[PDB]
Write an enzyme that holds these catalytic residues in place. Structure first.
Site, PDB file in Angstrom:
ATOM      1  N   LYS A 122       4.473  14.281  -4.213  1.00 53.55           N
ATOM      2  CA  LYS A 122       4.540  14.443  -5.652  1.00 53.55           C
ATOM      3  C   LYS A 122       5.841  15.153  -5.977  1.00 53.55           C
ATOM      4  CE  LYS A 122       0.761  15.650  -7.825  1.00 53.55           C
ATOM      5  NZ  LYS A 122       0.383  14.395  -8.526  1.00 53.55           N
ATOM      6  N   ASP A 213     -10.426  21.753 -17.930  1.00 47.61           N
ATOM      7  CA  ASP A 213      -9.834  20.551 -18.532  1.00 47.61           C
ATOM      8  C   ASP A 213     -10.419  19.277 -17.928  1.00 47.61           C
ATOM      9  OD1 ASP A 213      -7.548  19.755 -20.460  1.00 47.61           O
ATOM     10  OD2 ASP A 213      -7.099  18.572 -18.666  1.00 47.61           O
TER      11      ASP A 213
END
Lengths: 286, 127, 27, 180, 86
Positions: A122, A213
């Site tokens: 990433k 979240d």
RNA sequence: AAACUCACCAGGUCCAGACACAAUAAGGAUUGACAGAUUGAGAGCUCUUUCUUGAUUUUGUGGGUGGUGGUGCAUGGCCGUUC
């Protein structure tokens, strides 16, 4: 946008240079001209401006001709190519590319390891890119800080993936063949996993960091085992993490009671069975 | 076999008549004008059944379009047909009815969505 | 174009004026 | 004289029809050599052979065993018994060809480079380098009468050489004791 | 044989450039094959930087190469060989 | 968006020797208002098999006149651009 194809023309002339100048641009931002040789101990005129004019087009360095404070800077590829070069140097990346995956400050770049099993490079680039005074300072350290804050429940018995290296913007996360809750169709044990959403934030209050979240992309029923489908949990729920001292937990604690009530009922018209739990227990049983 | 109705009626028809019962996107083609490009094709067809070991297999005579229509009359001859380069051998039968000879084409080394091995040839090995 | 450049991108065949979309704010 | 041929080597005085392998006598940092087939008409050559060894660094005399001139020798060349070493090792070069068929910008359509399809397709693992030294790798190719698609420093011309790499290693040859 | 010193003297002194410029070019006629001739050996990067070695295990090794006194160095045994006589 | 567009493709040929002299040059070198063979994946073209030809031009060749190879190097105004 992105360039990748300006790297493979070099020699050893830049390999001694890099992390001497990367720890040298941090000790001494924008570097003037006759220092690339002398930070690394490279010689003065044995294949030198040949190699710096080689580096010049490649956008990992640029000729910033200011008035006697010249610039040789290790554009945006001074982090990007040179962290690819750093993972070539720190024994993880052996060539570039089997990569599919898009974010903003997290692109999923599908790679195969030194071992042979896959993982994911990433990459962190926020502001798109906008790489400046703090944006480089963030993606250097938010690659380092989130190398430190992806183990908060792996030691404590629960499921957080593990980070491997933090080279300049790159965070390597095995690779996870996930199935998020918008991709899935049916389930075999429904009423266990609604009350385990009260109970995951129960687990999050043990470590002292409450995460919230939850959208429809979050909970990956992944592939640990492919054949027999021993799945697992990847919980992409992290960045709503709040220190509980701050005065916003009046509406974080009440989220743990009466906010998850839609998805196992509606997505999975099937009105649910089970009980629930609060977090009043977790205030004392840390 | 052409419709199910009598076979001694249907096989030698030109670009005229039944399509005036058929809709006008394939009536503004076949009931306007015969387009006699398969008329000298018969004259090369009438020799493409003579000197064969008969009823079995004639020669692959080439044909290089994508909007040309074959008529079924010619049971027992072979023509090679455009597929982008080469000429697919067709033993011509009443087993194609008003569809393109140049429909014989799916022209690619196949689309790599299940085995992506030629995508691996474009990626970056790197010094 | 009009002969004071080597203009190869954003070429114009429209309306004979030979002034680019990128040249409304130059030309 | 072609340099894969039996020359009667003296390194000193005594004679052996040795079968050498001459390689370039430049200043070699890494002490890595070539299987150069043949000779160069001026510079220093480095033979490579098996000899039955007389270890005292003599001015070597390589010749042809015939009483040709008024000398009873045909003196081919003098030099130096450099060493007897096993790790003084060879690497024969190749230079393949690329003849650019047009004058492109990024992807240069090159022909006269690859004829056969399994010589096109399977030979797509070879590093592309220009005679100017612009190294790189083959990302695609389609040419038949052989193209490619890569990225170099600038542009290319029909008199360039888009070369490729076969760096191969042949193996040395022993002596023959001549006394007559 | 003096005639082939005019017949083959066209080539057996002017093929000296087949070593230099096109050393192992796979040469390309439509009859010549690419796979078979230059097949059975590596292809590293650069002669001033690469890595080639001494003793492989092949039939390509001759008789008094794989039955050697494997000369260690000359310079690091000339002190031995001469100092065996010193 | 149709073949063209449209920068690419699956296969063919109309066509290259002028300038000098060298082999044949007007017994046909090589020319054309035409009759066929003509087709390579669909063409005009050719003149061995009517006959214009009109001195002229055919070719293994090289200086390179042929820069209808200019990418140009700037030089000379002139206006996008930089002010």
């Amino acid at each position: 946008k992105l360039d990748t194809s300006h790297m493979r023309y070099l020699t050893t002339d830049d390999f001694r240079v890099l992390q001497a100048v990367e720890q040298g641009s941090r000790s001494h931002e924008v570097v003037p001209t006759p220092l690339i040789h002398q930070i690394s101990g490279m010689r003065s005129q044995s294949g030198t401006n040949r190699a710096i004019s080689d580096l010049a087009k490649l956008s990992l360095i640029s000729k910033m001709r200011n008035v006697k404070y010249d610039g040789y800077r290790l554009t945006y590829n001074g982090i990007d190519y040179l962290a690819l070069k750093t993972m070539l140097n720190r024994d993880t990346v052996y060539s570039v590319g089997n990569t599919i995956g898009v974010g903003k400050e997290s692109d999923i770049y599908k790679v195969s390891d030194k071992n042979g099993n896959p993982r994911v490079m990433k990459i962190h680039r926020l502001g798109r890119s906008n790489q400046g005074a703090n944006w480089m300072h963030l993606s250097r350290l938010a690659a380092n800080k989130e190398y430190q804050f992806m183990s908060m429940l792996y030691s404590k018995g629960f499921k957080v993936p593990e980070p491997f290296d933090n080279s300049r913007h790159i965070v390597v996360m095995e690779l996870i063949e996930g199935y998020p809750m918008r991709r899935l169709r049916k389930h075999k044990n429904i009423p266990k996993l609604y009350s385990d959403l009260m109970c995951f934030i129960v687990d999050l209050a043990n470590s002292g960091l409450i995460h919230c979240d939850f959208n429809e992309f979050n909970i990956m029923i992944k592939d640990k085992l492919e054949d027999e489908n021993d799945c697992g949990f990847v919980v992409i729920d992290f960045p709503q993490c709040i220190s509980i001292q701050h005065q916003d937990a009046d509406y974080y604690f009440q989220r743990d009671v009466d906010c998850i009530r839609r998805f196992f009922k509606k997505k999975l018209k099937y009105e649910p069975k089970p009980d629930s739990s609060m977090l009043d227990t977790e205030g004392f049983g840390d | 076999s052409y419709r199910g109705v009598d076979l001694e009626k249907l096989l030698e028809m030109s670009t005229e008549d039944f399509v005036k019962l058929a809709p006008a996107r394939v009536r503004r083609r076949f009931a306007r004008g015969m387009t006699s490009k398969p008329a000298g094709f018969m004259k090369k067809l009438r020799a493409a059944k003579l000197a064969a070991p008969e009823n079995e297999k004639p020669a692959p005579v080439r044909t290089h379009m994508r909007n040309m229509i074959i008529v079924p009359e010619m049971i027992g001859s072979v023509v090679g047909i455009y597929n982008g380069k080469a000429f697919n051998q067709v033993e011509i039968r009443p087993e194609m009815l008003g569809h393109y000879l140049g429909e014989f084409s799916i022209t690619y080394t196949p689309v790599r969505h299940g085995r992506a091995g030629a995508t691996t040839s474009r990626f970056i090995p790197l010094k | 174009q009009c002969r004071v450049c080597s203009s190869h991108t954003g070429l114009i065949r429209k309306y004979g004026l030979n002034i680019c979309r990128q040249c409304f704010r130059e030309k | 004289v072609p340099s894969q041929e039996p020359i009667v080597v003296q390194y000193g005085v005594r004679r052996y029809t040795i079968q050498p392998l001459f390689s370039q006598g430049s200043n070699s940092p890494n002490n890595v050599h070539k299987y150069e087939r043949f000779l160069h008409p001026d510079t220093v050559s480095v033979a490579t052979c098996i000899a039955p060894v007389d270890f005292t660094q003599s001015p070597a005399i390589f010749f042809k065993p015939s009483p040709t001139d008024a000398k009873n020798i045909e003196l081919i060349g003098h030099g130096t018994f450099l060493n007897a070493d096993h790790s003084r090792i060879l690497a024969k070069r190749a230079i393949l060809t690329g003849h650019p068929f047009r004058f492109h910008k990024t992807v240069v359509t090159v022909r006269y480079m690859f004829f056969r399809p399994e010589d096109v397709e399977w030979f797509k693992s070879i590093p592309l380098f220009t005679k100017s030294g612009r190294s790189g790798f083959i990302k695609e190719s389609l040419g038949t009468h052989g193209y490619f698609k890569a990225t170099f420093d600038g542009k290319l011309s029909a008199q360039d050489v888009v070369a490729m790499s076969l760096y191969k290693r042949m193996w040395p040859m022993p002596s023959l004791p001549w006394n007559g | 044989s003096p005639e082939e010193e005019e017949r083959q003297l066209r080539e057996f002194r002017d093929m000296e450039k087949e070593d230099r410029e096109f050393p192992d070019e796979i040469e390309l006629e439509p009859s010549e094959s690419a796979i078979e001739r230059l097949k059975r050996y590596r292809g590293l990067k650069n002669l001033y930087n690469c890595d080639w070695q001494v003793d492989e295990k092949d039939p390509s090794s001759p008789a008094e190469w794989k039955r050697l006194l494997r000369i260690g160095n000359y310079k690091n045994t000339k002190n031995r060989i001469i100092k065996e006589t010193k």
